[PDB]
Structures are given as structure tokens and as C-alpha cells.
């Protein structure tokens, strides 16, 4: 299916974003959802025209994957909708929530066709609010909604300086994940161990310990191991990319991209074997203003007054004032796999190999 094209675009976009994010987010944890971001932008893209549309099409890698009422990319919006409904369905011991919303200044009338397309393809994804004379109340309402959707974890996503009387569009995107390990780690076996941030800096961390059969890629020439950890319920799994050397992370961050990740995680390289796993208990929250990042990736017009969103509104002045992303991830409970120094990780949707979260664990 073309779903593989959308999965590949998401991964290519994921590493485009990582390349920008790590410039400004050095020596700290990173956590974001390329999937929820690309879906948020796809919803905007549906209403973009001219150069703004062209820039988004290239930056989102849609150009590599009788006009329909919701545009030529209607098949892409449909695939995103079907994918999101799969992974956000709540199960026992599985909670993944995505909050995705474009807020529009009420004096910019929304074209009926765009409202219809959003209702069918991105339901509840568009709201009109009075930024002009109630921008601070609108901000608190938006932040409350994000806080509610993320089970209290993503607070104050839109900071006080971010909205004013001139705000016309705000793109808000948040993702929440709380999962449980398929092999429930022994409660009487998790213990406090040193996490070696560098060879010189150590911080204590609560380490989950598991001795079980896992798929693992052992790649000496790449100086890494990659462990697959299934979740208890749902169709998601975590991959952990552990550098062999204590500070081997930078070398891997310099070279990783979609093609390399595919080579390193090739099912032919994966072997099912008994592994003694030490993994830090992970509870990571990160918030990003993605405006600069997305402009640097080539979507400049979307965030300045020459934005062309005339598929959203006919109004004279429209642009995205802020694109903000909040991500929360929590996990709770032979060859060695001792993740006690900085590493990369991702959460993927197994049926489609789509990357849902990508991140760096730098320090407890
Ligand atoms: C580097 O960037 C620069 O170049 C790129 C690349 O373009 S290039 O290869 O030509 O060099 C530019 O990006 C491309 O162009 C964009 C753009 O021109 O807006 C954009 O194209 C998409 O949006 C166009 C505008 O849509 S609209 O709704 O805002 O009007 C659209 O063109 C229009 O299509 C409609 C249509 O067919 O529905 C036309 O409407 C008219 O025809 C209908 C019936 O047709 S019929 O044959 O007579 O029966 C009527 O129902 C309708 O009433 C009627 N309206 S009327 O006012 O004209 O009378 C309309 O005339 C067209 O202008 C594009 O559709 S297309 O089929 O004509 O190509 C649409 N392309 S799509 O999304 O791919 O399907 C895109 O961003 C991009 O298009 S591309 O093909 O992907 O490359 C970029 O703008 C430019 N930037 S710049 O340098 O800064 O300027």
C-alpha cells in the first residue's frame, strides 16, 4: 500500500527535525512525535496554496509519495486518519493520546470547504477563537485543553508572550504516552545504578532489569546495539539504540538518517536471543516552539505575512503565529544490554513501521 510511502515520509521528516532540534537542544533529553507533527502540518497543508503549499509539500516529503473536494493529497489525509485511529485507541495498560488543533482568529472567516474537510479528515482539529480582544483568555483555554488531553503532564504549552491581539493562527500539537512492558520487569529487581552521562559525570537512576528473550541487533562495526522491546498491549514497540562507547552517541547522531536506521534495523540483522536488559525508568516531558525549526526546513512562508493559506480563509492577513509541540512519554514496570550512558530511542507502530516518538535519553 501507499502507507509505506507515508511511513517513509514520516521517517525522513523525523530525521530532518532531529537534525534541527539537536542544534539547540544539546546535552539534554529530546522527545518528540514526528507523526503527530506531520499530521498537524498536513491539516494546514490541506488549506495552503501557492508558494506556501509548495514549500510544505517538499519539506514534508509529500512530493515523493477531477480534483478531489479536499485536494490532490486526499489519499494522504485518509491514510493519516486511519493510522491515528489505530494507535490512539485505548487498551488495557495502553494509553496514547494525541491533541491536535489549529486555533484561528474569529475575524478570519473559515471557508466552508476547509471546515468540511477538517471535520471529515481531522475531526475536531479546528477552532475559532477571539484572539483580537481575548488573547490571554484564549491562551489559558488552549493550555487547559492541552493539559487535560495530556493527563496533566503538558502544562503552559503556550507561554505568556506567545499570543497577542495580532495572532491569527496557532498550531497546537501534543502527544501523551503511558505504557507498560510486555515482560513486566521484576519489582524486587529494579535498583538504583549510576548513569554515566560522560566518563566524568554520573547521576543515579532507577534501572529496570529484565532477563528474557529479545530481538537485538549487535553491530560492532557501527559500535552499537539496538534492542526491540515490545509493549504489553497495543501494536507499538520501543527500539533502543545504545552506543557501545560511553560517549559514542555524538558519532551516531552525526550519521543517523532514515537510510542508515533502515540498514541498522534490518530484520536480517535482528537476532532473537536471551538478553540481560538494564533500562532507566523513563518519564520524559519536552515542549518545543517549532516555528524556527520548520522555517529552517524550508517552510518559511507559513510563518511570515506572505503565507498563502487561501484554502483556509479568504481573509487578508493570515499566518501561523506559533507552532508548538508537547510530548510526554512514561514507561513503568545472556548478552548484556546496559543502557547506562546516553542513547537514542524510538517508539514505532509495528504494523506499519511508522515512527511515533523519537528521542534522546541524555540524563536522568
Ligand atoms: C517554486 O515555487 C513556485 O513554483 C511552484 C511549482 O509550480 S510550477 O511547476 O508551475 O513551476 C508553485 O507551486 C505550485 O503552484 C501552486 C499555485 O499555483 O497555487 C500550487 O498549485 C496548486 O494550487 C493552485 C491554486 O489553487 S487555488 O484553489 O488557490 O486556485 C492550483 O491551480 C488552480 O487549479 C484550479 C483547479 O483546476 O481546480 C483552477 O481553477 C479553475 O479551473 C477549474 C476547472 O478547470 S477546467 O479545466 O476549466 O474545467 C474551475 O472549477 C475553477 O472555477 C477555475 N477557477 S478560475 O479562477 O481559474 O476561473 C485554477 O485556474 C488554477 O490556478 C493547482 O492545480 S493545477 O491542476 O492547475 O496544477 C494546485 N496544484 S496541486 O495541489 O498539485 O493539485 C502548488 O503549491 C504547486 O502546484 S504543483 O503542481 O504541486 O507544482 C509555486 O506556487 C511557486 N511559488 S512562487 O515562485 O513564490 O510563486
Numbering used by the authors: 8 to 72, 84 to 351, 372 to 402
From the reporting publication:
However, OVAX possesses antibacterial activity against Listeria monocytogenes and S. Enteritidis, and this activity is blocked in the presence of heparin glycosaminoglycan. Although OVAX is mainly expressed in the magnum (responsible for egg white formation), it was identified in the eggshell and its relative abundance (emPAI) was elevated in uterine fluid during the terminal phase of eggshell formation (45th based on EmPAI value).
X-ray structural analysis of OVAX complexed to Fondaparinux (a synthetic pentasaccharide derived from heparin) confirms the ability of OVAX to bind glycosaminoglycans in a region that is close to the cationic domain that was initially predicted to bind heparin. The analysis of OVAX structure also reveals the presence of several negatively charged regions. In addition, five of these eggshell antimicrobial proteins bind glycosaminoglycan moieties (VMO1, AvBD11, OVAX, MSMB3 and pleiotrophin), which opens new research avenues to explore their interactions with avian eggshell glycosaminoglycans and proteoglycans.
